[PDB]
């Protein structure tokens, strides 16, 4: 799947537009994790 | 072959762009 460019089905654990390439998903996934990291940083230092 | 080398670079670049560790939230009595 990676060499052909299609996103592996074991990584799509959230809704994505139909026909997204793996490169776009990887960039989108990185941004989502960065938001989660910022949320985790704020929650750890600052409470709820 | 050639596909091994180009995929190795692509996977290595992806590992760099993708963040490494994501820390879990700490549960507290008022947090829950």
Is A48 in Cβ contact with B14 (below 8 Å)?
A: no
- Best mutation site among A6, A7, A8, A29 for testing chain B: the one with the most B CBs within 10 Å? A29
| Secondary structure class of A6 (helix, strand, coil) | strand
Residues 6+ apart with CB under 8 A from A47: B28, B31
Distance CA B6, CA B14 (A): 12
Rg (CA), chain A: 14
The alpha carbon of residue B26 is apart from the nearest alpha carbon of chain A, in Å, by 7
CA distance A42 to A29: 20
Q: Do the chains contact at A44 and B23, CB–CB below 8 Å?
A: yes
Q: Which of A3, A7, A4, A2 is nearest to A21 (CA)?
A: A7
DSSP A21: B
Quick one: resolution in A? 2.8
Method of structure determination: cryo-EM
Cα distance between residue A23 and residue A25, in whole Å? 5
Q: What is the dihedral of CA B23, A10, B6, B10, to 10 degrees?
A: -30
> Hey, are the CB atoms on B3 and A3 less than 8 Å from each other?
yes
């Amino acid at each position: 799947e990676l060499v052909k460019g299609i996103l592996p089905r074991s990584w799509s654990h959230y809704t994505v537009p139909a026909g997204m390439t793996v490169i776009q998903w990887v960039s989108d996934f990185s941004e989502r994790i960065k938001q989660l990291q910022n949320i985790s940083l704020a929650a750890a230092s600052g409470g709820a | 072959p050639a596909w091994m080398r180009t995929l190795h670079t692509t996977a290595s670049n992806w590992l760099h762009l993708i963040p490494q560790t994501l820390s879990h939230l700490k549960r507290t009595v008022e947090n829950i």
